[PDB]
């Protein structure tokens, strides 16, 4: 199973945007027409589909200090990887 394609299906189900514009290299903010409240609804749906909690506060803190890039958390191919890590950490 592709975690990205799972994530893209959730984004398409929530936002009024076509599935074909949702690509692995797309930034969830900045590249897709998605604002902060739309993303919180997407996060909630991600959190439930995968049984995890996206650590949105701590991720944004990490980027603020430069110890992480926006791309490693919010470009979709990388978001899929972060999700897999969270799911694995749940063990």
């Amino acid at each position: 199973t592709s975690t990205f394609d799972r994530v893209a299906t959730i984004i398409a189900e929530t936002a009024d945007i076509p599935r074909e514009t949702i690509t692995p290299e797309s930034h969830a903010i900045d590249d897709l027409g998605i604002d902060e409240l739309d993303f919180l609804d997407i996060a909630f749906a991600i959190d439930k589909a995968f049984g995890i909690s996206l650590p949105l506060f701590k991720w944004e803190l990490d980027v603020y200090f430069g110890s992480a890039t926006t791309e490693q958390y919010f470009v979709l191919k990388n978001l899929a990887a972060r999700i897999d890590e969270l799911v694995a950490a749940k063990g």
Partner: antibody
Framework: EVQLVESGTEVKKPGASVKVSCKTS????????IHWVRQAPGQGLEWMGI????????SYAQKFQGRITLTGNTSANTGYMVLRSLTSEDTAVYYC???????????????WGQGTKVTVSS | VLTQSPATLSLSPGERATLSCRAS????????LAWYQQKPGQAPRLLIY???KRATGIPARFSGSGSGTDFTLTISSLEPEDFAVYFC???????????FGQGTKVEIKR
């Protein structure tokens, strides 16, 4: 046991600068932030700032911006705080506490030091 | 800013304790609130984080609830060791900042 231990010279003259050390042990130093919190006698907790051992970044409460410097030495597993231009109002117990950088479990100030006194007095 | 009410709760052992914390604005920062217990001469101790998640090793009689502007810490039945001061705490980004409430004292009613 995870442990944080504060240390420093207690009695400081007004106008002087005090340096407090927070020696940590029992956990991966670069996986947690270091927060500094102080408590004047009889008062509540007052957050002062956050230090990030990964990259050395900081964020200070508005009240202390310009007067405070937070640093660290990861090889020594130790965070430091410098508060300058001390007055009577800086007399307090000073705490360091940890906060996970990369985890959702115990997502808070989960372990604190015992606190060390700074008394600003002539 | 966080506001804690009341400043003092006077209750007997075994009674339910309800502590309140109100924020300046609805908590934009993911509805996050943390509660800490502090006894005299002791460091604060984390009880609750993310408004509702109990920290490791905290007894089940402590529960947290609320969202937006208003939160509560509930101690379903007070044990003798629970008489202490309790602080709530919020956090925000842009810029990173943390603030504490002024604290609520749970004391022994007589």
């Amino acid at each position: 046991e995870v442990q944080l231990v504060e240390s420093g010279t207690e009695v400081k003259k007004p106008g002087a600068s005090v340096k407090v050390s927070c020696k940590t042990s029992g956990y991966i130093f670069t996986n947690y932030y270091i927060h500094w919190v102080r408590q004047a006698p009889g008062q509540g907790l007052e957050w002062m700032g956050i230090f990030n051992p990964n990259g050395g970044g900081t964020s200070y409460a508005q009240k202390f911006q310009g007067r405070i410097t937070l640093t660290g030495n990861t090889s020594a597993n130790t965070g430091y705080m410098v508060l300058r231009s001390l007055t009577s109002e800086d007399t307090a117990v000073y705490y360091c506490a940890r906060d996970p950088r990369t985890s959702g479990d115990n997502d808070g100030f989960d372990m604190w030091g015992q606190g060390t006194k700074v008394t600003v007095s002539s | 800013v966080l506001t804690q009410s009341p400043a003092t709760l006077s209750l007997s052992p075994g009674e339910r304790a309800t502590l309140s914390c109100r924020a300046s604005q609805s908590l934009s920062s993911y509805n996050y609130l943390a509660w800490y217990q502090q006894k005299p001469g002791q460091a604060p101790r984390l009880l609750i984080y993310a408004a509702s998640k109990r920290a490791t090793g905290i007894p089940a009689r402590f529960s947290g609830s609320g969202s937006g502007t208003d939160f509560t810490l509930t101690i379903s039945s007070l044990e003798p060791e629970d008489f202490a001061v309790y602080f709530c705490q919020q956090r925000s980004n842009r810029p990173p900042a943390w603030t504490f409430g002024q604290g609520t004292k749970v004391e022994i009613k007589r």
